[PDB]
Amino acid sequence: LAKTTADPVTTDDTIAFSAGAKHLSSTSQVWWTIDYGAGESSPRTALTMTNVGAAAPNAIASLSNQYTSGGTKLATLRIYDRDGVGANTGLLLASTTVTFTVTPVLYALESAVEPFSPIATVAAKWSFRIQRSKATPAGVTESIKC
Amino acid sequence: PTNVPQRVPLPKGFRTTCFDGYELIFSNDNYTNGVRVAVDAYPYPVGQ
Amino acid sequence: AAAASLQGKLQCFIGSTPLWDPYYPTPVFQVLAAAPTYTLSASVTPAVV
Amino acid sequence: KPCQPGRYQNSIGQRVCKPCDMGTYSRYGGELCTKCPAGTVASKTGSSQCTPCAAGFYANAPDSATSCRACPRGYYGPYSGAYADNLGDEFEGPRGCYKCPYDFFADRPGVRQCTACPPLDLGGGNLVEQCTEDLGSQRCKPCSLLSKPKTARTEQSPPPPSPSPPPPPPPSPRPPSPNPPSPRPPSPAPPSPN
Incomplete structure (x- = not known):
């Protein structure tokens, strides 16, 4: 599996990776799972293995995911041999997990009070500027509750 | 500049680099610091 | 009552995830006190213009 | 065995590890030597670490630096990680x-x-x-x-x-x-x- 978008900035943009599964000979139906930082696929998808081991990348569904936070992803793709639907665990064959680091987005906060020195029994208004790192994703509105 | 090899097993005498003001010499004679004690001690010459 | 050293704490949430990590300390703001009076003194050169 | 820090190897099956370039550090092993990140300098060939130079000095060039030198006479450096951009106002x-x-x-x-x-x-x-x-x-x-x-x-x-x-x-x-x-x-x- 290889990442297509590249330069993964956590929640910014989209993280796309396209995999390719080869088997030497005697190619038949495989079950392929995709595992993100947490949670695996429930239906476990369904792979059709048509090419031969010479042709490495077979047509696997290009699944993309939008992670959260700056932690490493370690995107696992587990292939289960036997079925899976009938409450029977499949056999791990390749796995071949790849991990890619990301860059989280930090938030800045600046405060200013008025009046600038609090006199006893006098109301004060604290104004706060909130600054976002880099730029807001296109067509993505965020509502903050402070 | 002069290269420094990564960790090589050397028996006793052979020393990659000396410290703070000592000129490495490829001799058999027994040296402590830079002043010598014995001569023709080591069978094969080593880095003093 | 008017205090000399104020320390306010703010926490923000975009949805569920907070902006300020709990491991990191919450922002603290020192916004002065005692209501000081500012005196202004002038100096001019030259007098007539 | 992995190449000891200060050297690198970029070919499968090489008995000797080549020494890292001047102004570059290496960890245990490493296919290629990674240059000093931002405002620091190694100042030696095959060094295991790029030293982040003290305040009052600036790196010769950004990223790839040779030796951190003091700021000019009418200058000061408030931060350790002070580095010349090498483009725009010299230093x-x-x-x-x-x-x-x-x-x-x-x-x-x-x-x-x-x-x-x-x-x-x-x-x-x-x-x-x-x-x-x-x-x-x-x-x-x-x-x-x-x-x-x-x-x-x-x-x-x-x-x-x-x-x-x-x-x-x-x-x-x-x-x-x-x-x-x-x-x-x-x-x-x-x-x-x-």
């Missing part, structure tokens, strides 16, 4: 050396506290303030000289310092004690008498 940067303009001067690349000139004293009584003529000047000059109102240059405000690193996460729980084995088989039953 200035966002975290690099600044001129400490007009009021302040250093005149001897020693510290980041550029001094606000000495106010000279004419005789015993008279006191006169000293201001420079060109942003950062070496020798101060008394005020009321050379067109003071000319001074129109941009005045920036420093960004806030980076926050503290997070504390290490808790270690992985130790494995539990092994469960007790199945009980021993019973003694064979006695044979039928006769």
